[PDB]
């Protein structure tokens with residue numbers, strides 16, 4: 141576990157349908173993630189600079205280029221996926237091999253209803269990636 | 272206080288529920304404990320060789336037997352307790368009398384919410400036991 | 403450097419909070435100071451007669467008056483400070499000019515994490531201060 145990580149600039153891109161993963165699910169998940177990451181010594185220091193819905197793998201590269209071109213110092217994009225989807229491969233293609241943007245994916249079902257264990261799982265993955 | 276102690280091989284046995292005491296709580300606690308123990312000259316070196324959840328006093332002896340048989344040179348088992356529980360008495364019976372394995376219990380609340388004072392308390396007890 | 407020093411009656415006053423300078427920090431620092439001072443022939447002997455936390459410059463004079471009255475033959479008060487603080491000036495006012503008590507200050511960072519070099523720095527300062535004095 142890495143100490144001294146602070147996440148100051150981050151975004152959320154939700155590829156799950158809004159009707160299944162609503163704004164209140166996203167805001168609850170956001171605040172619960174911020175709380176446990178601060179508890180663990182990896183504080184997420186503010187609200188995401190960007191939190192929007194996207195549909196389809198075709199939206200990945202334009203949205204990520206937009207993020208890179210709009211938010212200086214972006215550290216992480218949290219990507220909500222609706223189950224198994226071709227969106228995953230495209231997010232990793234653009235993030236890992238095109239633009240060099242750290243991404244962390246999370247399943248829609250763990251945003252609709254968080255648990256401490258699944259928030260912990262996400263925190264540890266982020267800590268490894270940014271550490 | 273005894274100088275010259277080095278804790279190379281150690282384990283965590285968490286008898287508190289994972290939903291209350293998550294993996295990222297355990298890993299963050301571990302790093303804070305490593306830091307203060309190193310500063311005080313009794314370094315708890317490396318990650319634990321073993322870190323697993325269990326439930327119930329009846330799980331103590333099977334788990335501790337596995338630890339003793341599996342990790343030669345094991346020096347300490349850190350045991351996380353869910354409040355007041357028969358787990359404590361069984362940990363002391365199995366550790367001190369049945370198997371001969373040094374153990375140090377810590378309350379779940381002090382893993383969920385670490386403070387320098389409670390980490391210091393833990394180091395001093397570990398120092399007495401291993402010194 | 404004076405040979406033949408034996409520091410038998412000494413105290414610790416910690417003006418940094420316990421949250422910063424914990425019990426295990428104090429006890430580790432004490433044992434490591436005891437070991438190096440013995441090896442260098444100026445042994446700081448035994449546990450301190452007094453080891454307590456306090457806060458603020460106003461707490462200095464009551465505590466030092468208590469120390470002077472309670473522990474006859476007190477040779478040294480080791481004073482742990484968080485850094486720059488008005489407590490330092492008060493420690494030296496009360497110790498040097500009011501009560502005539504030897505004090506040696508140490509920064510809390512060097513109690514939180516001792517090193518041989520900073521323990522040596524402290525022993526040399528104590529040796530100058532107490533060597534030859536009565």
Ligand SMILES: O=c1ccn([C@@H]2O[C@H](COP(=O)(O)OP(=O)(O)OP(=O)(O)O)[C@@H](O)[C@H]2O)c(=O)[nH]1
Pocket residue numbers: 221222223224225226228232243244245246247248265269
């Ligand atoms: O189609 C998919 C694929 C994956 N996922 C979910 O994405 C999450 C993994 O998302 P990650 O961001 O961790 O991908 P990664 O493993 O490639 O990152 P590295 O640490 O290896 O660099 C997992 O939770 C998985 O269930 C989906 O939800 N749908």
Ligand SMILES: O=c1ccn([C@@H]2O[C@H](COP(=O)(O)OP(=O)(O)OP(=O)(O)O)[C@@H](O)[C@H]2O)c(=O)[nH]1
Pocket residue numbers: 352353354355356357359360363374375376377378396
């Ligand atoms: O039922 C209990 C009993 C004890 N404990 C917790 O065990 C911890 C002590 O854990 P120890 O490992 O230090 O037990 P010990 O026998 O070696 O030390 P002493 O108690 O004799 O001083 C304490 O922090 C206590 O809160 C429980 O949580 N539940």
Ligand SMILES: O=c1ccn([C@@H]2O[C@H](COP(=O)(O)OP(=O)(O)OP(=O)(O)O)[C@@H](O)[C@H]2O)c(=O)[nH]1
Pocket residue numbers: 483484485486487488490491505506507508509527
């Ligand atoms: O405000 C302060 C002042 C000093 N100190 C620390 O006190 C230590 C020295 O404390 P001393 O106890 O050795 O003072 P002194 O006899 O040398 O008196 P003068 O030199 O001022 O005449 C030094 O290590 C310094 O960092 C503080 O921590 N805070």
